[PDB]
Write a protein that binds this ligand. Structure first.
Ligand SMILES: *[C@@H]1O[C@H](CO)[C@@H](O[C@@H]2O[C@H](CO)[C@@H](O[C@@H]3O[C@H](CO[C@H]4O[C@H](CO)[C@@H](O)[C@H](O)[C@@H]4O)[C@@H](O)[C@H](O[C@H]4O[C@H](CO)[C@@H](O)[C@H](O)[C@@H]4O)[C@@H]3O)[C@H](O)[C@H]2NC(C)=O)[C@H](O)[C@H]1NC(C)=O
Ligand SMILES: *[C@@H]1O[C@H](CO)[C@@H](O[C@@H]2O[C@H](CO)[C@@H](O)[C@H](O)[C@H]2NC(C)=O)[C@H](O)[C@H]1NC(C)=O
Ligand SMILES: *[C@@H]1O[C@H](CO)[C@@H](O[C@@H]2O[C@H](CO)[C@@H](O)[C@H](O)[C@H]2NC(C)=O)[C@H](O)[C@H]1NC(C)=O
Ligand SMILES: [Ca+2]
Length: 475
């Protein structure tokens, strides 16, 4: 059973790898409907680098070696497009570092290319060096959109919460591996203004802060609180840094605890028609916005991780409720895949969806699915933490729903409406996180235990970045 399911995930991943190599490699990604290529990530081959940690875990040496040969030829100092510090960090930087830790440890005997392996760190060093000038600002809070050749930017006055708060894991990890503390220092300085929020009006509830920070002085510029896009991974990394080195980041852990508790006390929300369902809402100067995103479903998995590590049954319980809410958005549609955004405000329910809202508990705002993994991710933590089979099965139903709805001759495509036969229409798009996240969590849920699997209590020896790349925990 489980062995056959794991093998079936490997097949789906292999299917996409073949089409990508066939029509697009070395470009960043495959365009799955026209069987062509695109470069949404600066042209360094994002799908190939993102695919590395997953291939190593699945045991596909051919795929690993092809990727290792490709890394050696990349020139991170050249690109014809503007650069996102955040995306470049969570996909490229973390993808090479994870491969190195995986190949230098639990997977040492997978290939003979020690020289190409060593180069994964060398290239990680070079990428950080080309990017670091982004941090050289008054406060230390960076510009997320830079031009790596002129050193110019988009002229922004503020930098977002998530884009500022989701770099410390990979940047600190490079320092611990090279011995050059500059990376750990630059990223931690930017992270500092987020742990000690100012003005106080920008921290409406303990541990929940605004969505923008002035690059000039480090002060927040708004008081909007949320776990949706723009904010999300900031809270995610607070706890994960504690798992990385509980010694050095006990303070991060303390800031996450406050955030978790204020969220249970204020952001928690139950739709009027479906009181047994739970979602998180947004908050702005006393008003609660009752809508969420697929992205936000990463939330249950964070509560479950902080829950088992800190032996807090109340966080584990709250996490499972968020998992149920997200499962609900999935099994309520025709394809069995959930929507990008939705709402549950009794005063705004669309008349055409009246019937649907009444039974499911929500109304759909954007019915597309861009091959995202946030829900499978959290379904994966619930199964690892509780040990219940129901969560493993929910990962399989989702995986199968995607394979039948999104698959094409070359790979998988995003779709326009999860509540229409075949998903409406397919988008000519396949993001690299299809290889990094969708295929890794689906596989890990049915595969054998190992060091890279998420663990209970304080037993974790690896810690996943936001793009599903596992990093060896410090010392
Ligand atoms: C489509 O999507 C829906 C919505 O998510 C799925 O239904 C949910 O399924 C989960 C998983 O079983 C349900 O969670 C479990 O609910 C049990 C019953 O809870 C009711 O009764 C208790 C009485 O004490 C009340 O407290 C509670 O408010 C409810 O009224 C619980 O007993 C379960 O907890 C036990 O197991 C967990 C581990 O899984 C432990 O942590 C607990 O300590 C305890 O041992 C668990 O909470 C959930 O209730 C369902 N939600 C809804 C809204 O129905 C469907 O299954 C899915 N359909 C398909 C096809 O998959
Ligand atoms: C990044 O900055 C460089 C500036 O060095 C921009 O490149 C210049 O673009 C002008 C526009 O025609 C050319 O005439 C120059 O010859 C270019 N200079 C060099 C050395 O290439 C580039 O446009 C910027 N990139 C982006 C995406 O805005
Ligand atoms: C994922 O989709 C693939 C392709 O649609 C499924 O594999 C096909 O299965 C049919 C029988 O149902 C075979 O006749 C084809 O030869 C298979 N295609 C290929 C190229 O392998 C696959 O079963 C689906 N995965 C799961 C777990 O349902
Ligand atoms: Ca993520």
């Amino acid at each position: 059973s489980n062995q056959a399911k794991a093998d079936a995930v490997k097949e789906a991943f292999q299917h996409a790898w073949n089409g990508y190599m066939k029509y697009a490699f070395p470009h960043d990604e495959l365009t799955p409907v026209s069987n062509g290529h695109a470069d949404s990530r600066n042209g360094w081959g994002a799908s190939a680098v993102d695919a590395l940690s997953t291939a190593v875990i699945m045991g596909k040496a051919d795929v690993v070696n092809a990727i290792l040969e490709h890394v050696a030829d990349i020139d991170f100092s050249k690109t014809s497009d503007t650069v996102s510090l955040f995306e470049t960090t969570i996909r490229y930087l973390a993808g090479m570092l994870s491969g190195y830790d995986l190949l230098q440890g639990p997977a040492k005997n997978l290939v003979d290319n020690q020289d190409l392996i060593d180069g994964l760190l060398d290239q990680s060093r070079n990428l950080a060096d080309v990017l670091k000038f982004a941090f050289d600002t008054p406060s230390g809070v960076p510009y997320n959109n830079i031009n790596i050749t002129s050193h110019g930017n988009d002229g922004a006055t503020t930098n977002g919460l998530a884009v500022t708060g989701t770099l410390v894991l990979e940047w600190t990890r490079l320092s611990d591996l090279t011995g050059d503390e500059e990376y750990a220092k630059l990223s931690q300085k930017a992270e500092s203004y987020l742990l000690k929020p100012q003005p106080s009006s920008s921290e409406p509830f303990p541990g929940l802060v605004g969505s923008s920070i002035n690059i000039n002085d480090g002060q927040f510029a708004d008081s909007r609180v949320s776990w949706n896009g723009g904010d999300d991974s900031f809270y995610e990394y607070l706890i994960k840094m504690y798992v990385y080195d509980p010694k050095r980041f006990e303070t991060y852990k303390d800031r996450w605890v406050l955030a978790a508790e204020s969220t249970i006390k204020h952001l928690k929300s139950h739709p009027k028609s479906r009181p047994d369902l739970t979602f998180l809402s947004s908050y702005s100067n006393r008003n609660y916005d009752l809508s969420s995103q697929h992205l936000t479903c990463f939330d249950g998995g964070s509560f479950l991780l902080g829950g088992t590590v800190l032996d807090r049954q109340d966080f584990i319980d709250f996490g499972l409720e968020l998992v149920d809410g997200c499962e609900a958005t999935y099994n309520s549609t025709l394809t069995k895949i959930g929507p990008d955004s939705w709402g549950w405000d009794p005063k705004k329910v669309p008349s055409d969806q009246k019937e649907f809202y009444e039974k499911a508990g929500f109304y759909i705002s954007s019915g597309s699915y861009v091959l995202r993994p946030e829900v499978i991710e959290s379904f994966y933590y619930a199964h690892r933490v509780t040990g219940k089979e129901i969560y493993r099965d929910w990962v399989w139903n989702a995986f199968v729903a995607i394979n039948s709805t999104c698959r094409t001759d070359s790979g998988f495509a995003a779709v326009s409406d999860v509540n229409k036969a075949n998903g409406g229409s397919k988008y000519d798009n396949q993001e690299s996180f299809l290889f990094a996240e969708v295929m890794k969590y689906s596989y890990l849920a049915h595969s054998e235990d190992a060091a890279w699997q998420v663990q209970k209590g304080g037993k974790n020896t690896f810690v996943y970045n936001t793009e599903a790349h596992p990093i060896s925990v410090a010392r």
